[PDB]
Amino acid sequence: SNLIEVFVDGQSVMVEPGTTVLQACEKVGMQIPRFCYHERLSVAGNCRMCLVEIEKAPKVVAACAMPVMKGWNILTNSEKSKKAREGVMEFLLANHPLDCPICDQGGECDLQDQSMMFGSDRSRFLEGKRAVEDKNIGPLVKTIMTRCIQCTRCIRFASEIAGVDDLGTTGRGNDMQVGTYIEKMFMSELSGNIIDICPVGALTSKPYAFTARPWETRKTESIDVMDAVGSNIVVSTRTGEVMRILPRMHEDINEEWISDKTR
Amino acid sequence: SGVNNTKKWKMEFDTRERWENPLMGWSSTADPLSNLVLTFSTKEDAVAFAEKNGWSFDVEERKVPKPKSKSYGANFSWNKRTRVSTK
Amino acid sequence: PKKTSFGSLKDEDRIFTNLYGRHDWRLKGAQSRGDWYKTKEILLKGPDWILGEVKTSGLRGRGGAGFPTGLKWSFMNKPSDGRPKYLVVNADEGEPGTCKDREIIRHDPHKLVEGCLVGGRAMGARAAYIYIRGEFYNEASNLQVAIREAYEAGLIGKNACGSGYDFDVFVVRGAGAYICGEETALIESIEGKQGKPRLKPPFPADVGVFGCPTTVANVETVAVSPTICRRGGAWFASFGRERNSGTKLFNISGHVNHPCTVEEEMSVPLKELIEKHAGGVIGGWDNLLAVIPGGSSTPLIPKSVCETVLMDFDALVQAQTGLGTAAVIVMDRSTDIVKAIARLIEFYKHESCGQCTPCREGVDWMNKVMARFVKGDARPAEIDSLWEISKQIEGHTICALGDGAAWPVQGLIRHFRPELEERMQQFALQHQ
Amino acid sequence: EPFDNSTYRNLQHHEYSTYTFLDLNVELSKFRMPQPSSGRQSPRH
Amino acid sequence: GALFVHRDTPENNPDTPFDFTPENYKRIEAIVKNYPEGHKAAAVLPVLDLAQRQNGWLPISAMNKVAEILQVPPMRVYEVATFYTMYNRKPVGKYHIQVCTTTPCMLRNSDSILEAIQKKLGIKVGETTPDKLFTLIEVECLGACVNAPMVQINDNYYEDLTPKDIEEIIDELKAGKIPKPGPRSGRFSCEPAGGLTSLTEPPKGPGFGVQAGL
Ligand SMILES: Cc1cc2nc3c(=O)[nH]c(=O)nc-3n(C[C@H](O)[C@H](O)[C@H](O)COP(=O)(O)O)c2cc1C
Ligand code: SF4
Ligand code: SF4
Ligand code: SF4
Ligand code: FES
Ligand code: FES
Ligand SMILES: [K+]
């Protein structure tokens, strides 16, 4: 019908008008690297790791917020697109503290996985590193703001998903402290899901803290029974007991969110 | 956020009794078949695998992501409430 | 026909005839200069006239954008969509070297607000939202009295200049930033938000503020509009070369004897502006080591290249820099170019909003490594390393500040490369 | 009336009170058109 | 003071008695009317500006009070306060010295000016006098880079400013007398020091170059 035609690194595909570049990539199976966009959580466009070069481009387009139109060959594996990813990632990783052994995100961290696939293999940093003072917003989720990369995924999650305005990014320049500025607490009924949207170990579950590592956690599929919603969840079991509970992908029942009581 | 796991089919079993070893607190298990999962590209071969050795058999349909109608101008609206409160 | 000897701007040729505030800067002197006259007629003629006059005017982007405003003002000129159209004047002027609009806001605001209303007719807007800089408090009250004398006279407001037009003009005094200098972060400053550059598309044109169409323009670009639309755009376009059509309030500062924001004929070699109008520089042409051509973002130019080039957009572009806001800064041999942009790049780190990672992380990383460059704590391959990250944050940022930071250091790398090598040589030698 | 060359006529910038910008701000409300309505008075409403 | 987390101190606490004088409600209602209804969050900027011009700072109580009077969540108030420069969340010493330090100014040796009020006033950068008169901060360009190194004192700046000009500016300042703002030298607004070059002949009359009907 009105589905505009467009290419993706060669092969052409029709697509609904108004669709962004990211949402055009996975139609053929391209998961372009992203760090500040969630498919069901607004559009930020600040991580800049979605940067992919279009054909005949003079500049790399941000695939998150660029609507695509007729005849735009998505140059996924292009040298400049990989160059843009390489440069932008090292900037993210530049001020990231060396906490991977002590950080629970280790083994299931998007920052780690990205650096294996789309990343360098050494450092050109020769300076100090930013040190963000920690915060405290509840006993259910830990706060380590030095590991944060300001994807702002939390503040959108609080604003729309949780319906509570208590998260923000105070400061300026390198001093983007994401938190609450004033001392406050975050126990929204979906505040537990703030852990999963975080791509790094900046937000982690205090009850699960320092209890297991992702590779050993055998996963099982079950249901939530705390509530009549009957949310689909995945139970982690290792060495014969349960450590943490994760929401499953079920657009009808729970989407990818679960209540704090369930988590 | 990566999805290079939601693309195949597996052959997982039902978990059985897992008791702690008296000495060293192990997870001694008498289920020989517990730690075994196969990988199947599509599904009917996975089921075609299933009956040929005649195991108790059931499936689950692939939870395909519904198309999210994304936008960026919605965060800056004039009447609609999709105006984002922070950026 | 082609007056290749560009220069020697006449008083009538200066569209701001009171940018110095010498005579009556208030409304009582505005109409004496030529303001608030024949405006009734040009508004009633229809939007196409101002679009037509600005086409032959060729007034390009004077806020550093470098884009023909005739196209941009007509870019969103569409029939009414229900959502009211608005106007915004970029009165930030936070660049280390931007002062002309500060003089304009303080002394020539009536032609500025008239430019909003004559422009508002062109783009079919019903209100202006000029973003006066917060540090500009004294000159903020200067255009509120200009706001005052114009509203009750029917020049602006309901029946704007007596043409059945409801265009208004609101003022938002800032609270201190440069990021709000760029229009995409400017809009959020009005839209009850911390200064964050908005991603385009959606553009400011179709939807600028509170979800409605809006237009963003540099202070002079709207301010010159009534003057070019009254006497003639072709007369304004006579000044300067091709696509360099017009004049510019050159902002002379730095190691210059008599710094002065002079509205002077544009596309003129810098030798003329420093000597004729600024009374020479500190120590003469021999003394000056390099000159910031037109803005802090624009890479500085040394005597080796700036011996002949004309200060025009096209010649500046091929000079691996930009004319921008004509913020010319002179500096001599005595000052060190590294310590010069050291304070400049430090100011950039002190401004970045931190939205996109390249600007948030790279600029601070630039500050640390360049701080070593001041003493010289880097090996020769670090300049290439500094060049590499300079290309990394160039263009990859949401806004143009990130590349606006790349250009000054990039120009310093390409020009004073041996100076960096010898400065580093002294660093290791004295600290052996 | 005669053209001057060494006279500054912007003495008001010196003599501006602390609320001067606010003093004009409170009182230009007279020349105000009906502000556009969003179908509601807040985007949380 | 370089602390983007708020410490609940007994003086600056949510219990601090902040309010507005009768004139302010006319001022802040003048803020809200300037913008279309439906999106009145624009007023969070000038309302917070109003508190700057009343309290001399922004206590956490002021930001919290701004929240409900703006019908906005309290954090959006904090975000506006924390970003922009002179939205000071910390007490300031009467007169705020904003010495312009960026490259065009320092090129004409702002350090001489910075050294001038450093040694004479006797307090370091960002500090306050023991009895609350002066506070010096090394600010960047405010928009008057053409002149000599600038000092923005509270709301009135001082341009074409020399280190010897700065000590006499603060000579009368500590006595309570405010000097004339603007370019301190013979330069009035923007003319060259060695005599004005432009603006010689009288400006043209009202309306020139008529294009027929125009
Ligand atoms: C970091 C940055 C700061 C800017 N500051 C200003 C400014 O102070 N004034 C201005 O008019 N334009 C400024 N601009 C340019 C604007 O983004 C925009 O291009 C300009 O307002 C267009 O003006 P015009 O429509 O008159 O050409 C800035 C851009 C950047 C990237
Ligand atoms: S969040 Fe990721 S990169 Fe950071 S310490 Fe944890 S595992 Fe390492
Ligand atoms: S704490 Fe986590 S979710 Fe929040 S902004 Fe930082 S990285 Fe994003
Ligand atoms: S370049 Fe990026 S971080 Fe810097 S001001 Fe622009 S949007 Fe913010
Ligand atoms: S996905 Fe485009 S920046 Fe994060
Ligand atoms: S240089 Fe002093 S104001 Fe910008
Ligand atoms: K996480």
Q: How far are the Cα atoms of A173, A204, C428, E10 from residue A130, in angstroms, in the given order?
A: 11, 20, 28, 30
Q: How far are the Cα atoms of C67, C359, C397 from residue C180, in angstroms, in the given order?
A: 19, 15, 16
Q: Bridge partners of C216? A: C88
- Residue A202 C-alpha to ligand 7 middle, in angstroms? 6
CB-based contact A173:C350 (threshold 8 Å)? yes
Residues E91, E95, E101, E104: is their CA dihedral positive or negative? positive
Rounded distance between C-alpha atoms, residue C189 and residue C193, angstroms: 5
D3 interfaces chain E, CB cutoff of 8 Å: yes
Q: Indicate the resolution in Å.
A: 3.6
Any residues with CB less than 8 A from the CB of A226 and at least 6 apart, and which?
A259, A261, A262
Phi then psi for residue A12, to 5 deg, are -95, 150
Rounded distance between C-alpha atoms, residue C37 and residue C230, angstroms: 9
Any residues with CB less than 8 A from the CB of A203 and at least 6 apart, and which?
A141, A142, A143, A144, A154, A194, A195
Of C161, C188, C208, C220, whose CA–CA distance to C37 is shortest? C161
C245 CB less than 6 Å from ligand 4?
no
D12·C157 Cβ contact <8 A: no
CB-based contact C43:C89 (threshold 8 Å)? no
B65 interfaces chain A, CB cutoff of 8 Å: yes
- Atom 8, ligand 3: residue with shortest CA distance: A151
Rounded distance between C-alpha atoms, residue A226 and residue A233, angstroms: 12
CB-based contact B34:B13 (threshold 8 Å)? yes
Residues with CB under 6 A from ligand 3: A 148-154, 178, 197-200, 202-203
Q: Running DSSP on this structure, what letter comes out for residue A133?
A: P
CA C195 to chain centre: 18
Rounded distance between C-alpha atoms, residue C302 and residue C341, angstroms: 14
CB-based contact C249:C103 (threshold 8 Å)? yes
Rounded distance between C-alpha atoms, residue E208 and residue E78, angstroms: 51
Burial class (CB in 10 A: 0-12, 13-18, 19+), C98: buried
Query: Technique behind this structure?
Result: cryo-EM
Rounded distance between C-alpha atoms, residue E198 and residue C11, angstroms: 7
Rounded distance between C-alpha atoms, residue C85 and residue C101, angstroms: 24
CB-based contact C159:E66 (threshold 8 Å)? no
| Kind plus residue range of the DSSP H or E element containing E134 | strand E134-139
- Please give the single-letter amino acid code of residue C199: L
Of C354, C174, A133, C177, whose CA–CA distance to E2 is shortest? A133
C357·A62 Cβ contact <8 A: no
Please name the residue that has the structure tokens 């380590």: A144
Phi then psi for residue C340, to 5 deg, are -60, -65
E27·D6 Cβ contact <8 A: no
Chains in contact with D, where contact requires at least 3 CB pairs less than 8 Å apart: B, C, E
D38·B78 Cβ contact <8 A: yes
CB-based contact E120:E129 (threshold 8 Å)? no
Rounded distance between C-alpha atoms, residue B69 and residue B71, angstroms: 7
* E100 marked as part of a ligand binding site: yes
Rounded distance between C-alpha atoms, residue C20 and residue E189, angstroms: 6
Helix locations, chain E, DSSP H: 22-33, 44-55, 60-69, 74-83, 103-107, 110-121, 163-174
Chains in contact with E, where contact requires at least 3 CB pairs less than 8 Å apart: A, B, C, D
Number of helices (H) and strands (E) in chain E: give both, helices first. Answer: 7, 5
Annotated binding-site ranges of A for [4Fe-4S] cluster = 96, 100, 103, 109, 148, 151, 154, 198, 201
Helix locations, chain A, DSSP H: 21-25, 79-94, 110-117, 153-156, 194-197
Radius of gyration of chain A (CA): 20
Retrieve residue D33's tokens.
């058109």
- Residue C351 C-alpha to ligand 4 middle, in angstroms? 9
Rounded distance between C-alpha atoms, residue A59 and residue A80, angstroms: 9
Of E34, E48, E104, whose CA–CA distance to E80 is shortest? E48
- For residue A42, which residues of chain B lie inside 8 Å, CB to CB? 75, 84
Residue of E nearest to D23 (CA): E27
Rounded distance between C-alpha atoms, residue C148 and residue C263, angstroms: 27
Q: Sheet containing A218-223: give its strands across.
A: A218-223, A232-238, A241-247
Q: Which atom of ligand 2 is nearest to the CA of A199?
A: 1
Terminal Cα-to-Cα distance of chain C (whole angstroms): 64
Window 212-241 of C: residues touching B by CB (8 A cutoff) are 212
- For residue C21, which residues of chain D lie inside 8 Å, CB to CB? 8-10
